[PDB]
Amino acid sequence: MKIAVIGQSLFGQEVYCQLRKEGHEVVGVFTIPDKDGKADPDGLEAEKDGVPVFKFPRWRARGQALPEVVAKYQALGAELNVLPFCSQFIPMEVINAPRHGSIIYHPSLLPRHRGASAINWTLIHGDKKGGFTIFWADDGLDTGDLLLQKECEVLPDDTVSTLYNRFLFPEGIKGMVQAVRLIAEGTAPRCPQSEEGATYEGIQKKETAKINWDQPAEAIHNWIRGNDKVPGAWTEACGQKLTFFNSTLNTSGLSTQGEALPIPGAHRPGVVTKAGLILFGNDDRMLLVKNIQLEDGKMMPASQFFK
Structure with a gap:
């Protein structure tokens, strides 16, 4: 043809x-x-x-x-x-x-x-x-x-x-x-x-990718992964857009240790742990974000947010 x-x-x-x-x-x-x-x-x-x-x-x-x-x-x-x-x-x-x-x-x-x-x-x-x-x-x-x-x-x-x-x-x-x-x-x-x-x-x-924190953890998980890689789901915190990658809902057996990370809008702050960043829905269930990117383009494992 x-x-x-x-x-x-x-x-x-x-x-x-x-x-x-x-x-x-x-x-x-x-x-x-x-x-x-x-x-x-x-x-x-x-x-x-x-x-x-x-x-x-x-x-x-x-x-x-x-x-x-x-x-x-x-x-x-x-x-x-x-x-x-x-x-x-x-x-x-x-x-x-x-x-x-x-x-x-x-x-x-x-x-x-x-x-x-x-x-x-x-x-x-x-x-x-x-x-x-x-x-x-x-x-x-x-x-x-x-x-x-x-x-x-x-x-x-x-x-x-x-x-x-x-x-x-x-x-x-x-x-x-x-x-x-x-x-x-x-x-x-x-x-x-x-x-x-x-x-x-x-x-x-990127503009329409802002996280709505007033949602069950699952939906937040679906939102992140549904924007995951392009354009990148994000939220304003620590003076900047924070972009999240590699979300999971499988937090079974994961510790909630480490440094808190404040997020305007989120039910609960959320902790930087050695396995990544724990996050919370308006149903107080957890998700885990494994990777963050800072507004100035720096990519990192979420575990080392405070380095």
């Missing part, structure tokens, strides 16, 4: 590579402009292979597609668009252009967690089950007909990073590859999303 790849990241790069190794013709790659003199890895790769690469700063002016970009895209003769991860809205003149349309990767079980921080919200809400979806793009936001889906059990201490690294990245790549395989054979499913169980949530940035 003739394929246009529109992304972004390392994920996008691996997807691109796997489609190539599968015998598909990557007819063009549409990626982001160089920032800070750094090249996006997907763009770099295709450039090395001699595939047409485009680095459009924008796709539209005044709500409609740029005649330039539509012309350059149109000339490739793509029969499928593959969108592994490109955070912005490609114009519908591009989306619908190919005979097989466009397919998008999404790291949640649609229609749950529509939006851009779907992994985060999986974890913040304590979902027992997580997953990823490949879907046919339509003019809505993560609303298009499902193609394939794949689930995984969420582990109690899973973070955004672990869940991503151990399932959502590797299996999502295989999922996107299979989806293309199915489209090539004519066996690709189409399953419209129902409004049952359908949610949307906004992006998690």
